[PDB]
Design a protein around this ligand. Structure first.
Ligand SMILES: CCCCCCCCCCCCCCCCCC(=O)OC[C@H](CO[C@@H]1O[C@H](CO[C@H]2O[C@H](CO)[C@H](O)[C@H](O)[C@H]2O)[C@H](O)[C@H](O)[C@H]1O)OC(=O)CCCCCCCCCCCCCCCCC
Ligand SMILES: CCCCCCCCCCCCCCCC(=O)OC[C@H](CO[C@@H]1O[C@H](CS(=O)(=O)O)[C@@H](O)[C@H](O)[C@H]1O)OC(=O)CCCCCCCCCCCCCCC
Ligand SMILES: CCCCCCCCCCCCCCCC(=O)OC[C@H](COP(=O)(O)OC[C@@H](O)CO)OC(=O)CCCCCCCCCCCCCCC
Ligand code: SF4
Ligand code: SF4
Ligand code: SF4
Lengths: 60, 145, 189, 393, 158, 68, 111, 149, 204
């Protein structure tokens, strides 16, 4: 109940990845793999990550 | 090169639901499907991500609602339950029905547990969900996951 | 008059030198590293805009039909019954046939609730065509992540290779896209 | 074995199953001994009916359709399909959207000439750089996949207000890298044909369309420029801020396959110059710098101005194509891709005629196969740059 | 009304109309078909040497078929040639235009396309065949009142 | 009489010798003659009918239809 | 020039077959119901399809011998074959190699 | 290659629509039997061959001249054109290079005083690499190589 | 009937290959037809270019075993890489019928699955290639990227490795051969091959 909830804002911290420093919106949580929604761009992208490479932000 | 016997059918009859680990380059596990079909089973090879809510698609009636391309109406099509319609429309002396799911990836753990319990409850129904990956064709029971 | 005999031998030896030169420079093509993206073990990463399989969230849907009226073939079958106990639209069984879909994500842009998102998933091959009718729980699944498969060495294609790199095969350890991001010039200037 | 041997001229089918990248057309040629006497081209094996589909589609849902005529340079089709309600309603585009349009269209011209160039060198007999041309075409594919989302065709990139989305964070750098990589390749492609006497023997005087006969037959693009006419629609029509650069239209005086080859190679060499001169004069530069300048300098100071936007008033899907008619055009990879739009204040057009760039260049193909041999058929068909999705549409 | 080719070139016993102008500044002319081969010929002897977009449309589901001709003065350089458009309105019960193939040969295949899509019979040009539909097809698919038959291939995917 | 959204069917004897019959075959398909063609647009004496077959819409006269 | 209408489940082939060759005849046309065996075809529904085909080729008297009319006959026979499959008189094969349901999925009658 | 062999064993017959059914099956056989039969001539060492065959390379040339009969047989026995034309084209190509092959072999038969390949190699295996015929036939090797390609 | 488009009960068909030698020879047979898989060089539309992007160097076509063939007689596979019109459909059924019997079809792109964006307002587009040909693997994506095509080829290989060698007999045609006499008028060949020599190009 304390773990990563859907509906908030995130930002990726996995450095050796195509998606880096990207802020996203977490949309669905099944089996640990977290799928976040990226508003950046005209088409909204859904890219799957895991909890070992994500951390929520405090500013927004 | 790996002359495989019929141990695969014995692990299928033992576990009831086994997860396959196929090399991702193509057809190196279909020899086991043909061994399984030669022992009297009827394999039903279909793609797992096209199924949704396997409690409803496999054993329940489900409205398909095909694509109207701006021309027809909604026009719901009530597909029969796949496992029970393919099990009742079978020879009565057959070995059973086997659901051969070719994409075990992009599925949840809950659907794996449901598939294993579904193979355990009704008597002649086995699944060979292909979660993929491994360098050789190797299979586990669908016990832990 | 041997002006056309020596010209004949000159054309012959010029063609022979051309064949020898082209044979020397096609022998310098074998030493180059092959650019083959070896698919089942080297699945190349799609870009941050790819427009693969459409993802749908059954709870974020106000049951309008904007995703149908902007789709080029009016494809998504959204059907609702109005519940006068609550007086909202109350969607039931949204679905998209991905054998008919042309993957333009018009329905993704013109979605007022950001319900429809698009994924990086393209391996959608099926044996039966009617299995491409993804209903609301089928297309509400988490997509296949190419960088999280323990059999694939994923490859950035060309627009994510840093500033001098043409092919993503010689990449040492996850070097980023081109350079700085808009959180750098705000700190610079 | 009921094949007899007559003295009358035979008939060669060359039917719709072409075992190369030649499209779907029949080429029923007679060719008595070797001289091609007659040539009936059968057309319409990809006629899917875009002109009747268009009358039942909104322009926001006909943009995914328009990549399928010239499906090697797809966005050129969007470059008329967007520009047809743009000039009825008078919707202005931003300067940044216009420069992004110029960059996308010149990359599409490079890719279209590369996909012409592969099969043309394979038909003329070179057949070594067929596998080396698809590499730079894949570079253009991966450039399009970052910005537009898809590869060479299925882009929804062009919109009535400009461009659907601005460029990514590393796009300008990698496009400059591709141009620095691609400047010597066009010189290599020119020296492959012109510094080899067997190829220029295969391409000299093969198809002898005149200057005035090219104007009479309605030829356009590199088939018109190779006959002698300096007619580029980017220069004739002051189109989409193409006059802010310094490029010269390539022409030749003969009109044969070698002249068309030279015009297309020099069109690649001029389009990459237009790419460089547009990347330099991009309003705000790359998107990372422009987004940073509109982030740190408040919400003001001309970087939030109109001509520094990617979209000029992103429109509702129920946009009415207003009452009135005109005829827009672009100079695509084959030249004069035109749209005759007669929209009548409906959400749909009333008539959407497609003037294809190579449907009017394929009618000269029986005229160009008059005094030619058998093995010079596929060269001449190679020199037209025919793509049957535009010919049939 | 007006028009820089009606008041300039059409006062040599040709008797044309003037529909106005386009939204791109192109001047339109309505021409009765019986003197089309006259009025195009004086436009070929004027400088309009390039025929682009020999189109055709319906102008209403029961009204007259139209066959349009978008002429232009293709010179050797830039800056906006005069670019006139001709329109020929033909009745639907007898659609029949004298072909302009012997003036501009560009209408060899564009008149075949407009005949294949609308049934406008072009008199004079050599091949009047279906160019896009199958050559044994019945009907004209780009008319507004085209009842397309229920072939099994044209039905839904089932 | 006939408005936008009415499921109309085509009267064959009214259609058989019109100028609407010049555009197509004289061997009319049976999707016209079932009450499932929906009127989507009326532009004066003619209506645009969308039939449930996945083929383009037909513009027929208003007196060639009847509300099923 | 052989006139034919080859789609799935019907082949028209205006002409007669001799050994494995169809020779183009003017005043006859053959019929090849389901050449790939997606359906089962008991003899009652097979005779029904044969009678419907002879009625269709009798009603098509007086028209041209184009491929358009052959395609019309084949499409009407396709709609009849799909109507027999939808009525339940014809089943899917299930011994075939493809099993792709080209005339609709199985579905229950009402709900 | 082995799968590309084995798959072609598994595929069916086609018989193109009025094919000869005797000349059709014999065309490939007539074009590949003398090429296999010409492997008597090749040595892998002194007496490491099937037979010496005093007319060795001349018999190889004579047997290779049977190829544009299986070519014309495969061209004729198909009832379609473009393969009869292709068969005549391949037979006109295959007889245009028999005579330069024969002349280039004739130069080596001059320099070797015979036609058997054991005697042809034995007149080169005297000084190892200096007695090879490519240094004494610099253009005959080119004529043989281009004519054999 | 209570099931609208029903499946039918088989005749209890089983091979029951208890032999392990013939099972391994069946494995060799399926591997050999699996790892060769020579497709027809068949195009017709947009998707073919992505198919050509497999034959190039960035994605490799050959590394699954498959080299493209010009003639359908040497073709083991057909990837229907584009829209099938009403004009192209008999030509496509002809070039599928001209292949040897262990043949495979991949419906590439949305135009051959269902006739994707032409499944609404087109009068000359076959809505799906399975209205003409038995299809093995369906391949979505309007231009399916070449990784998706050699994913469809991977699923086709998974399909091929299941095929039994005793089950050959599904490769049949099963003639029915109902012949009827008709009373239609023969028309002359409208399209003959006379384009410039026709006596209407010379003078009006
Ligand atoms: C293809 C399938 C291959 C077959 C299954 C594998 C067989 C492997 C066993 C190889 C046996 C050694 C061959 C040999 O020493 O052959 C000897 C015998 C007899 O040859 C005798 O050799 C003597 C010496 O002659 C030689 O020496 C003369 C000069 O004095 C000549 O100039 C000329 O060089 C040559 O003729 C005699 O003169 C006669 O020629 C003859 O009596 O030949 C023979 O039976 C040949 C029998 C068939 C051999 C085929 C395989 C050989 C090729 C692979 C060898 C690779 C092994 C090394 C690998 C390296 C590992 C580090
Ligand atoms: C020798 C003939 C014996 C019969 C062969 C049965 C078919 C083998 C197979 O399916 O895999 C095919 C394997 C290759 O992969 C092989 O496949 C094996 C099986 S695996 O992924 O567990 O598939 C694997 O163990 C092995 O490392 C790998 O090289 O071997 C073959 O190619 C067998 C054919 C070679 C000779 C036939 C003539
Ligand atoms: C000793 C031989 C002496 C024969 C000399 C004949 C000269 C008489 C004139 C001969 C003559 O005039 O008629 C031969 C004729 C060429 O001359 P044309 O008549 O076509 O020229 C047109 C006239 O108007 C001009 O004279 O035919 C050819 O094409 C073959 C010769 C050119 C072939 C060029 C390529 C051949 C060399 C390529 C070698 C490649 C192999 C090397 C690869 C490694
Ligand atoms: S547009 Fe979005 S919110 Fe509206 S119905 Fe479609 S998916 Fe739901
Ligand atoms: S992606 Fe395009 S084609 Fe697919 S459902 Fe959305 S709008 Fe329709
Ligand atoms: S599916 Fe899309 S890309 Fe493929 S042929 Fe059809 S329109 Fe072209």
């Amino acid at each position: 109940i304390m773990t990563i909830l859907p509906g908030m804002t995130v930002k990726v911290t996995n450095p050796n990845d195509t998606y880096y420093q990207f802020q996203g919106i977490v949309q669905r949580i099944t089996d640990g793999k977290v799928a976040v929604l990226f508003e950046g761009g005209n088409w909204d992208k859904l890219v799957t990550f895991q909890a070992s490479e994500l951390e929520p932000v405090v500013v927004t | 090169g790996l002359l495989a016997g019929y141990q695969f059918v014995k692990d299928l009859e033992s576990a009831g639901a086994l997860a396959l680990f196929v090399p991702p380059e193509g057809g190196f596990e279909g020899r086991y499907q043909r061994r399984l079909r030669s022992k009297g089973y009827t394999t039903l090879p279909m793609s797992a991500p096209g199924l949704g809510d396997l409690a409803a698609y496999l054993t329940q009636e489900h409205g398909i609602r095909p694509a109207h391309t701006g021309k027809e109406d909604i026009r719901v099509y009530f597909q029969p339950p796949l496992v029970t319609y393919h099990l009742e429309n079978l020879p009565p002396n057959a070995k059973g029905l086997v659901l051969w799911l070719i994409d075990g990836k992009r599925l949840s753990k809950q659907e794996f547990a449901y598939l294993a319990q579904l193979t355990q409850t009704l008597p002649k129904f086995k699944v060979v969900v292909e979660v993929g990956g491994d360098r050789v064709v190797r299979w586990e029971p669908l016990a832990d996951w | 008059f041997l002006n056309q005999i020596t010209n004949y031998a000159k054309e012959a030896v010029q063609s022979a030198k051309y064949i020898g030169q082209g044979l020397s420079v096609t022998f310098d093509h074998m030493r180059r590293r092959p650019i083959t993206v070896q698919y089942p073990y080297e699945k190349l990463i799609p870009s941050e805009r790819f427009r693969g399989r459409i993802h749908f969230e059954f709870d974020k849907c106000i049951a309008c039909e904007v995703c149908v009226r902007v789709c080029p073939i009016n494809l998504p079958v959204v059907d609702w019954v109005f519940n006068k106990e609550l007086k909202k639209k109350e969607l039931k069984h949204y679905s998209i046939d991905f054998g008919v879909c042309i993957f333009c994500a018009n329905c993704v842009e013109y979605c007022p609730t950001n319900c429809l998102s698009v994924t990086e998933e393209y391996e959608l091959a099926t044996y039966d065509r009617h299995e491409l009718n993804y209903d609301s729980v089928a297309m509400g699944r988490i997509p296949y992540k190419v960088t999280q498969d323990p059999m694939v060495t994923p490859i950035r294609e060309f627009a994510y290779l840093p500033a001098g790199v043409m092919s993503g095969h010689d990449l040492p350890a996850g070097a980023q896209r081109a350079g700085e991001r808009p959180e750098a010039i705000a700190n610079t200037a | 074995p009921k094949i007899e041997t007559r003295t009358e001229p035979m008939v060669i089918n060359m039917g719709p199953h072409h075992p190369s990248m030649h499209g779907v057309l029949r080429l029923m040629v007679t060719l008595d001994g070797e001289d091609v006497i007659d040539c009936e081209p059968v057309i319409g094996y990809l006629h899917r009916g875009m002109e009747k589909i268009a009358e039942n589609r909104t322009n926001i849902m006909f943009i995914p359709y328009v990549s399928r005529w010239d499906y090697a340079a797809g966005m050129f089709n969007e470059a008329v399909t967007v520009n047809a309600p743009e000039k009825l309603a008078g919707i202005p585009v931003p300067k940044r959207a216009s420069y992004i349009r110029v960059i996308m269209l010149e990359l599409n011209r490079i890719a279209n000439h590369l996909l012409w160039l592969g099969p043309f060198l394979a038909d003329v007999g070179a057949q070594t750089p067929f596998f080396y041309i698809f590499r730079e075409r894949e570079y253009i594919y991966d450039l399009f996949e970052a910005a537009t989302g898809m590869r060479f065709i299925n882009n929804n990139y062009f919109r009535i207000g400009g461009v659907a989305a601005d460029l990514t964070y590393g796009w300008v750098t990698k496009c400059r890298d591709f141009c620095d990589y691609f400047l010597p390749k066009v010189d290599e492609y020119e020296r492959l044909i012109t510094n080899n006497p067997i190829f220029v023997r295969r391409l000299q005087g093969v198809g002898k369309i005149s200057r005035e006969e090219a104007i009479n037959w309605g030829l356009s693009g590199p088939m018109l420029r190779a006959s002698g006419v300096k007619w580029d629609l980017r220069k004739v029509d002051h189109y989409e801020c193409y006059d802010d650069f310094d490029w010269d239209v390539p022409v030749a005086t003969e009109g044969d396959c070698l002249a068309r080859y030279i015009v297309r190679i020099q069109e690649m060499r001029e389009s990459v110059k237009i790419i460089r001169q547009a990347l330099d004069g991009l309003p705000g530069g790359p998107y990372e710098n422009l987004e940073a300048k509109r982030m740190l300098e408040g919400a003001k100071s001309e970087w939030n101005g109109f001509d520094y936007q990617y979209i000029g008033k992103k429109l509702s899907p129920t946009f009415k194509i207003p009452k009135g008619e005109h005829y827009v055009r672009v100079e695509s990879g084959k030249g004069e891709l035109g749209i005759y739009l007669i929209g009548d204040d409906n959400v749909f057009p009333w008539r959407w005629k497609i003037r294809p760039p190579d449907f009017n260049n394929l009618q000269v193909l029986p005229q160009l196969l008059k005094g030619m041999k058998v093995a010079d058929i596929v060269a001449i068909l190679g020199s037209i740059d025919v793509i049957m999705g535009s010919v049939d549409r | 009304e007006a028009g820089p080719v009606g008041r300039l070139l059409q006062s040599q016993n040709l008797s044309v109309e003037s529909l106005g102008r386009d939204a791109s500044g192109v001047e339109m002319i309505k021409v009765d078909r019986d003197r089309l081969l006259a009025v195009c010929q004086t436009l070929y002897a004027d400088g309009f040497n390039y025929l682009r977009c020999q189109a055709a449309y319906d102008s209403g589901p029961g009204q007259d078929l139209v066959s349009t001709y978008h002429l232009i003065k293709l010179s050797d350089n830039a800056d906006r040639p005069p670019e006139v458009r001709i329109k020929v309105f033909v009745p639907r019960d007898d659609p029949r235009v004298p072909s302009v193939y012997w003036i501009w040969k560009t209408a060899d295949w564009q008149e075949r396309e407009s005949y294949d899509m609308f049934g406008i019979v072009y008199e004079g040009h050599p091949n009047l065949k279906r160019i896009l539909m199958p050559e044994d097809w019945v009907g004209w698919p780009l008319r507004k009142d085209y009842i397309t038959p229920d072939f099994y291939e044209l039905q839904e995917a089932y | 009489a006939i408005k936008k959204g009415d499921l109309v069917k085509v009267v064959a004897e009214k259609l058989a010798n019109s100028l609407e019959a010049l555009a197509s075959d004289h061997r009319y398909p049976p999707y016209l003659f079932e009450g499932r063609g929906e009127v989507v647009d009326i532009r004066g004496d003619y209506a645009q009918i969308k039939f449930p077959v996945p083929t383009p819409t037909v513009w027929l006269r208003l007196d060639q239809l009847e509300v099923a | 020039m052989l006139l034919k209408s080859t789609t799935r489940h019907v082949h028209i082939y205006a002409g007669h077959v001799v050994d494995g060759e169809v020779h183009p005849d003017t005043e006859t046309l053959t019929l090849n119901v389901d050449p790939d065996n997606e359906l089962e075809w008991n003899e009652a529904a097979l005779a029904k399809v044969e009678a419907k085909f002879r009625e269709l080729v009798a009603n098509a008297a007086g028209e041209d011998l184009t491929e358009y009319n052959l395609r019309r006959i084949g499409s009407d026979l396709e709609h009849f074959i799909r109507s027999l499959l939808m009525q339940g008189e014809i089943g899917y094969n299930l011994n075939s190699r493809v099993r792709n349901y080209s005339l609709g999925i199985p579905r229950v009658n009402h709900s | 290659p082995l799968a590309d062999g084995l798959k072609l064993i598994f595929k069916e017959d086609v018989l193109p629509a009025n094919s000869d059914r005797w000349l059709f099956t014999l065309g490939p056989a007539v074009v590949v039997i003398p090429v296999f039969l010409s492997y008597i001539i090749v040595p892998f060492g002194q007496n490491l061959l099937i037979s010496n065959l005093a007319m060795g390379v001349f018999l190889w040339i004579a047997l290779s001249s049977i190829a544009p009969i299986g070519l014309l047989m495969a061209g004729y026995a198909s009832n379609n054109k473009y393969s009869l034309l292709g068969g005549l084209r391949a037979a006109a190509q295959s007889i245009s290079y028999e005579i330069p092959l024969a002349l280039a072999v004739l130069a080596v038969a001059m320099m070797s005083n015979g036609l058997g390949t054991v005697e042809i190699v034995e007149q080169q295996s005297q000084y190892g690499i200096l007695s090879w015929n490519v240094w004494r036939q610099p253009i005959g090797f080119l004529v043989f190589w281009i004519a054999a390609l | 009937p209570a099931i609208l488009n029903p499946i039918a009960r088989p005749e209890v068909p089983q091979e029951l290959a208890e032999n392990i030698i013939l099972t391994s020879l069946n494995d060799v047979y399926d591997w050999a037809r699996l790892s060769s898989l020579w497709p027809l060089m068949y195009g017709t539309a947009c998707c073919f270019i992505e198919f050509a992007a497999m034959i190039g160097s960035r994605f490799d076509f050959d590394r699954f075993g498959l080299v493209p063939r010009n003639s359908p007689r040497q073709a083991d596979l057909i990837i229907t890489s584009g829209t099938i019109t009403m004009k192209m459909a008999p030509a496509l059924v002809r070039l599928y019928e001209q292949m040897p019997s262990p043949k495979y079809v991949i419906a590439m792109g949305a135009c051959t699955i269902t006739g994707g964006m032409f499944s609404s307002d087109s009068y000359s587009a076959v809505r799906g290639v399975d209205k003409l040909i038995p299809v093995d693997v369906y391949l979505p994506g309007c231009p399916p990227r070449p990784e998706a095509i050699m994913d469809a080829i991977v699923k086709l290989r998974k399909k091929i490795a299941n095929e039994h060698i005793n089950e050959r007999g599904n490769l049949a045609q099963t003639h029915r051969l109902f012949t009827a006499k008709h009373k239609m008028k023969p028309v002359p060949p409208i399209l003959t091959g006379q384009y410039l020599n026709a006596p209407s190009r010379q003078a009006p």
